[PDB]
Design a protein around this ligand. Structure first.
Ligand SMILES: Nc1ncnc2c1ncn2[C@@H]1O[C@H](COP(=O)(O)OP(=O)(O)O)[C@@H](O)[C@H]1O
Ligand SMILES: [Mg+2]
Lengths: 161, 52, 54, 103
């Protein structure tokens, strides 16, 4: 409740609709009513057009009401959509992810049951490696650019988590 | 057996090959790099420097 | 008298005000001349390394 | 490039207050040139052709470039201002030669 979603919606208002290429919003473990708000806001703003093919945003949504597997792989689904728009189209893509912390949190929830000795604060032993294999796909190459804005939740206001 | 087809029977990827040079072209600018470069040479900015 | 002597000394140094303008001009052109020799070489090479990059 | 050294402490005291900004701005332009002039060679490295003669798959382009480049006479700007500032000095010295006479 400090303003991650308000700031990312401000960035969408300022940069996304004023953009030339395409945009991708991957909702990863957040409020479903915020996803509905975003859908209807993009419909009224002409960004998402239900009547023709002039739409400029692709939405991927696995929210906080989803089991941990869906919340762990919906970030990868959004990544894959943006990666197509970067490689096979050469476009300049905007990738918004909110929230990217739910990916790690769902990984921890499932790692509990996968029979793995837990690391610090009870997190999976493979935290940094999974985060790396996910984050190294969100990058600009010489085949296209991906301007990535990711909201990152901080547990208990601890930036050393 | 490519002298007839120079890309060893590419059969695809030409649709994206020209995108590669385009990305490569916007990296070197926009001018047609197949001819000699033009020129316009600038001159310094001067004033009167005497005892006012 | 001595104050009139110094006024002869100060005006003796006058020429520096014109020596700067000469120096500040003479090299100013050399700077443009030198930099002009890049805008030709830095571009013809650019149009050469292109046809070797592609 | 026959530069002339300048004692800035001598330059500092022989300026009148009514034009200190000009002479101070002239100082500003001065050192900015000195480093910029020293921050790049007098002549760029004349690029090779042998690496381009053979490793470029175009005919004529790698020579007519070098031919047109060599046949390109980049104009060096003439002074057209050194004698004009010298026109002031000789007159100034004339105005100051009489002053040291009357003194
Ligand atoms: N830039 C802002 N201007 C005004 N109010 C803000 C701003 N950012 C946050 N707030 C307030 O703080 C609250 C938190 O909003 P939110 O972005 O959803 O936090 P978070 O997503 O991190 O949980 C909002 O309800 C809003 O009232
Ligand atoms: Mg939020």
């Amino acid at each position: 409740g400090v303003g991650k979603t308000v700031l990312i919606m401000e960035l969408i208002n300022n940069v996304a609709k004023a953009h030339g290429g395409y945009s991708v919003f991957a909702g990863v473990g957040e409020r479903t009513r915020e996803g509905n708000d975003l859908y209807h806001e993009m419909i009224e703003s002409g960004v998402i057009n239900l009547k023709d093919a002039t739409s400029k945003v692709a939405l991927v949504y696995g929210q906080m009401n989803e089991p941990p597997g869906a919340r762990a792989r919906v970030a990868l689904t959004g990544l894959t959509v943006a990666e197509y728009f970067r490689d096979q189209e050469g476009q300049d893509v905007l990738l918004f992810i909110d929230n990217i912390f739910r990916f790690t949190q769902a990984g921890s929830e499932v790692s509990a049951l996968l029979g793995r000795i837990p690391s610090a604060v009870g997190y999976q032993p493979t935290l940094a490696t999974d985060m790396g294999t996910m984050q190294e796909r969100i990058t600009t190459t010489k085949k296209g650019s991906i301007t990535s804005v990711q909201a990152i939740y901080v547990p208990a206001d601890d930036l050393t988590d | 057996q490519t002298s007839g087809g120079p890309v060893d029977a590419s059969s695809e990827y030409q649709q994206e090959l020209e995108r590669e040079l385009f990305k490569l072209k916007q990296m070197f600018g926009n001018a047609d790099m197949n001819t000699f470069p033009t020129f316009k040479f600038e001159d310094p900015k001067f004033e009167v420097i005497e005892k006012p | 008298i001595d104050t009139e002597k110094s006024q002869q000394a100060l005006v003796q140094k006058r020429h520096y005000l014109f020596d700067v303008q000469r120096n500040n001009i003479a090299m100013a052109l050399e700077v443009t001349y030198r930099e002009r020799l890049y805008r030709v070489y830095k571009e013809v090479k650019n149009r050469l390394d292109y046809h070797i990059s592609v | 490039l026959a530069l002339k050294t300048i004692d800035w402490v001598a330059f500092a005291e022989i300026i009148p207050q009514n034009q200190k900004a000009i002479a101070s701005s002239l100082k500003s332009w001065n050192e900015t040139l000195t480093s910029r002039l020293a921050a790049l060679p007098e002549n760029p490295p004349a690029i090779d052709w042998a690496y381009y003669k053979a490793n470029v798959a175009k005919a004529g382009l790698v020579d007519d470039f070098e031919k047109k480049f060599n046949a390109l006479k980049v104009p060096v700007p003439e002074d057209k201002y050194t004698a004009q500032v010298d026109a002031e000095e000789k007159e100034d010295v004339k105005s100051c030669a009489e002053w040291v006479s009357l003194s």
